[PDB]
Amino acid sequence: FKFPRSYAALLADWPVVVLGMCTLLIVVCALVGVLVPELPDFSDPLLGFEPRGTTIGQRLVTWNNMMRNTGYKATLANYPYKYAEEQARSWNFQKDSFFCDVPSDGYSRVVFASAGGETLWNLPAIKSMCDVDNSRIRSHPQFSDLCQRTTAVSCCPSWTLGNYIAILNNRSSCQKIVERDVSHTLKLLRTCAKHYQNGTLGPDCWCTNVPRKCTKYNAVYQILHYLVDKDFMTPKTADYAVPALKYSMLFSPTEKGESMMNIYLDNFENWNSSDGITTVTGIEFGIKHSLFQDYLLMDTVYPAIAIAIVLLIMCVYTKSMFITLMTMFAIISSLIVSYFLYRVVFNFEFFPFMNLTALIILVGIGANNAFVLCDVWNYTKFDKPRAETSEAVSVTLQHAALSMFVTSFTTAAAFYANYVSNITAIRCFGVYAGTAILVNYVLMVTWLPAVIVLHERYLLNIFCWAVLCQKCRRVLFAVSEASRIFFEKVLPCIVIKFRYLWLIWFLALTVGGAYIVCVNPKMKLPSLELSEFQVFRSSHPFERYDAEFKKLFMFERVHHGEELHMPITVIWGVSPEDSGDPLNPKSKGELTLDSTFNIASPASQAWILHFCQKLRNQTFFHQTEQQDFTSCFIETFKQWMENQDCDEPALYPCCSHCSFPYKQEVFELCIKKAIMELDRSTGYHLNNKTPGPRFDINDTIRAVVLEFQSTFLFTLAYEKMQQFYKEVDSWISHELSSAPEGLSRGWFVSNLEFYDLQDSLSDGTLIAMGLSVAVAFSVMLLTTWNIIISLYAIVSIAGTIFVTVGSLVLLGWELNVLESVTISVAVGLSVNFAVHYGVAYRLAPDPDREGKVIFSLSRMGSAIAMAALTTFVAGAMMMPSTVLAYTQLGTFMMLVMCVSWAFATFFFQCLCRCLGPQGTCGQIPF
């Protein structure tokens, strides 16, 4: 084909070649990306929330692998199974005055409130609950088969006040009851409220120290413990004029689980939840996460509206459909090419649901690039209106391709910085967004200028409804002038005239941000446990169950408030190595057994026994009065040997006669005898959790695990949990340094999964900050070449972070997973506005501060404002969503927009006006 002597001439001369080449290369990526890599799945929205490389993580996955692999013939067995061959060679309640069970979690249940009225205790509300149960749940066909029935005729009653009250007044059903029953039951509860709080009127009855009449169907306990707000009856029960019920819970005689999915979708999901007298306000059918997949897809409309509005804006700004359509096509196609790269070339086997949320980011920064290019192109068409097309292209690129790089590169580098995190979902998201930004940048340099050539080559030729078009052209020209004089005079006037106000005002706002984030109420690590994470909008009937009602109903409030000790576990022979893929959350290593290990050497037998007793002196050991003969198994073996009198040839190696550091071989024999005996000397059977030795397929000892209870208690609170971990690990890790060989390389673990996420979120955040700020500062130097300007730019950027993070703290964000990503992103999104003002301030020909800033503002203000405004409106478009991440990104985009725009237009322009380098002293040579 024909040859042009320059790239800017290839654009001018054969732009169609560029478009053909690019559309080909999009479409082959679309094809391979659809065909070859398996489709992403969000049926588990938590899937990659897992720190990997962390020492606690490697220990945990190793331990988890041991539990998984332990079992009969398989590797790392729990008994000496080869030796275990040798031992073989050697409805109407006034009849139906009972419930099919006492309810619990594991049943499907709902929580009622009322839209008005101060107590649910009134008869109409009671009847409303049993009515709406019938009308929403029992009315469904499938329920009749889901039921924990006793007969087909009427399968089983639910648990609700409406049923207990009936039995307690010998009525047939909820529909028969009267306010005499309600008052009589209220008298029962007001009498029996005191007994229940003590626990004297306990769960099992029909208790013993309490009047039998209070507890005849065992009912009172169940009512107060399951059905009713813990605040309904209290020590103030009689101090209340009448007790007030804010909430009640109702239990279906059907499972909490996937089986409910139809009934929810059928009868709950899009009802107004109400009869006014009552409202369902919490629901737990268990389907919370399994519904997510479907919900995410319903919400993608909001992203689609965001794109449709970003189109409209770019049309109005560019005065063409065509440039706006082909830019939008480029923006979209970059997600396809990057998706191809991410699955195929980079060979990542997993794609977090979060990556879809990067679309709404990338359309914002896509429009940002489109603005500065079309703007500078139009500057060339004004600065040099008569030009040859390739020359005009060249000078446009000489200007724009640099600035449009550093918008993009700083933002990509902020997303790739999240690859430093130990968390797989974050590392993946940080890479996908990073590539899609850079792919989009390449299209904005190759594809887009070719379209600008086509626009001048052809598209100007094409030209009541007959005049309303002209009305609009007139009016939009009027705003083009009003906006022009606003930027070219008014905004500079505002900034200079009140410079001193703007400086202290924004400065105080940053201190507010810094105080809020860093001291009070300090930015907090997540403290709902992972298996209960929020995924829907906080108003949503599922989220209110985990968020509010688990605090309020006694069985929940107690069961999740109960004390459990940390099972301090210590392990040897298995190495603490994770050999899985550090990005694919489906992958894990197997075991890796260590040839240096043994226990049968008498030196080991001595040291390990001694070590348990040393482990028994440490302050953190909870010395139970109950004795676990599997904790420190070797003691149990020692005393068993000592109990073993000898009167047979077979028992000579296992004689009590021998000194405790036994010969390795007789240890290796007698240990098998002792443990295989445990099926007979006790009824207890081992399982994969059970402490003790562990076996080869041919029952050499390959490993051993010991376990002990802490003084400490299980908690989600990072500080207390950290105190526990650091103490116990430090002591064990020190003490192991004393051990004879092979025991030299043990390690410790216990129920620490949620702690390791918290500890990995803070470090993963902070380091991705330090990295993203460092790169953002380097770009600031490399563009402005003036250390003074860069210092101010960095101060303003830092200020935006403190105000955004501070306001997100006040909005009540934990440092949970998505949120902890966004904080790095904020650095990338913030920096580019300060870069634009920075370069324009140097490029000002004016000799003085005021001239320099006036030039910078008048030159950039429109394009900056569009970048902010488009991103902001795209963000706002996510607000109506139902999925939390969509709304969470939404708030964040709006907020970081205003804040970064405000600091970049005001504060940064004070520091230039009020302190800017007008002498050359801040400048550095190439």
Ligand X SMILES: *[C@@H]1O[C@H](CO)[C@@H](O)[C@H](O)[C@H]1NC(C)=O
Ligand Y SMILES: CC(C)CCC[C@@H](C)[C@H]1CC[C@H]2[C@@H]3CC=C4C[C@@H](OC(=O)CCC(=O)O)CC[C@]4(C)[C@H]3CC[C@]12C
Within 5-44, which residues bind ligand Y (CB under 6 A)?
7-8, 16, 19, 23, 25, 39-40
Per CB under 6 A, does 441 bind ligand Y? yes
Tell me 351's DSSP state. Answer: -
178: left (phi over 0), alpha (psi -120 to 50) or beta: beta
Map the footprint of ligand Y across residues 244-273, applying CB under 6 A: none
Per CB under 6 A, does 465 bind ligand Y? no
Half-sphere exposure of 274 (CA within 13 A, CB side): 6
Binding residue (CB under 6 A) for ligand Y from 398, 639, 656, 738: 398
**Of ligand X, ligand Y, none, which one sits near residue 613, judging by CB under 5 to 8 A according to partner kind?**
ligand X
Tell me 786's DSSP state. Answer: B
DSSP state letters, 723-737: HHHHHHHHHHHHHHT
Per CB under 6 A, does 136 bind ligand X? no
Per CB under 6 A, does 74 bind ligand X? no
Binding residue (CB under 6 A) for ligand Y from 244, 298, 504, 811: 811
Residue 275: CB minimum distance to ligand X, A: 6
Map the footprint of ligand Y across residues 826-855, applying CB under 6 A: 839
Neighbours of 159 (CB within 10 A): 26
**Of ligand X, ligand Y, none, which one sits near residue 879, judging by CB under 5 to 8 A according to partner kind?**
ligand Y
3-state secondary structure 519-546: CCCCCCCCCCCHHHCCCECCCCCCHHHH
449 contacts 442 by C-beta, under 8 angstroms: no
Residue 189: CB minimum distance to ligand X, A: 14
Per CB under 6 A, does 524 bind ligand Y? yes
Residue 852: CB minimum distance to ligand Y, A: 14
Give the interface segment with ligand Y, choosing from 57-65, 544-552, 567-575, 870-878 (CB under 6 A).
870-878
- Helices (runs of H) and strands (runs of E) counted in the chain: 31, 7
Backbone angles phi, psi at 887, to 5 degrees: -70, -40
Residue 310: CB minimum distance to ligand Y, A: 10
Per CB under 6 A, does 538 bind ligand X? no
Binding residue (CB under 6 A) for ligand Y from 302, 339, 633, 908: 339
**How distant is the alpha carbon of residue 813 from its chain centre?**
11
Binding residue (CB under 6 A) for ligand X from 13, 255, 275, 635: 275
Per CB under 6 A, does 64 bind ligand X? no
Q: Alpha-carbon distance 636 to 641, whole Å?
A: 9
Per CB under 6 A, does 402 bind ligand Y? yes
Q: Can you tell me whether residue 403 is helix, strand or coil?
A: helix
Backbone angles phi, psi at 631, to 5 degrees: -55, 135
Whether residue 521 is preceded by a cis peptide bond, meaning omega within 30 degrees of 0, is: yes
Per CB under 6 A, does 609 bind ligand Y? no
Per CB under 6 A, does 696 bind ligand X? yes
Give the interface segment with ligand X, choosing from 271-279, 436-444, 651-659, 900-908 (CB under 6 A).
271-279
Q: Alpha-carbon distance 686 to 611, whole Å?
A: 23
Backbone angles phi, psi at 352, to 5 degrees: -65, 150
**Of ligand X, ligand Y, none, which one sits near residue 16, judging by CB under 5 to 8 A according to partner kind?**
ligand Y
Binding characters for ligand Y, 484-523, by CB under 6 A (x = yes): x-x---x--------------------------xx---xx
Residue 399: CB minimum distance to ligand X, A: 59
Assigned token pair, 322: 């065509």
Q: Is the dihedral of CA 81, 85, 86, 90 positive or negative?
A: positive
Give the interface segment with ligand X, choosing from 580-588, 690-698, 776-784, 809-817 (CB under 6 A).
690-698
Residues in contact with 461: Cβ distance below 8 Å, sequence separation at least 6, in sequence order: none
Per CB under 6 A, does 67 bind ligand X? no
Binding residue (CB under 6 A) for ligand X from 154, 274, 290, 664: 274
Per CB under 6 A, does 801 bind ligand Y? yes
Residue 109: CB minimum distance to ligand X, A: 22
Per CB under 6 A, does 697 bind ligand X? yes
Which candidate, 114, 358, 154, places its Cα nearest to that of 253?
Answer: 154
Which candidate, 20, 27, 45, places its Cα nearest to that of 332?
Answer: 27
Assigned token pair, 456: 């001048």
Binding residue (CB under 6 A) for ligand Y from 721, 868, 874, 889: 868
Residue 65: CB minimum distance to ligand X, A: 16
Per CB under 6 A, does 311 bind ligand Y? no
Q: Can you tell me whether residue 147 is helix, strand or coil?
A: coil
Map the footprint of ligand Y across residues 724-763, applying CB under 6 A: 762
Residue 618: CB minimum distance to ligand X, A: 9
Which one, 203 or 521, has the nearer CB to ligand Y? 521
Backbone angles phi, psi at 571, to 5 degrees: -135, 145
Map the footprint of ligand X across residues 88-107, applying CB under 6 A: 94-95
Cβ burial 57-93 (10 Å sphere, 16+ → b, else e): bbbbbbbebbeebbeeeebbbbbbbbbbeeeeeebeb
Per CB under 6 A, does 198 bind ligand X? yes
**Of ligand X, ligand Y, none, which one sits near residue 762, judging by CB under 5 to 8 A according to partner kind?**
ligand Y
Q: Alpha-carbon distance 185 to 161, whole Å?
A: 10
Residue 213: CB minimum distance to ligand X, A: 12
Neighbours of 437 (CB within 10 A): 28
Backbone angles phi, psi at 244, to 5 degrees: -120, 125
Contacting residues toward ligand X, per CB under 6 A? 94-95, 115, 170, 194-195, 198, 200, 272, 274-276, 610, 613-614, 617, 696-698
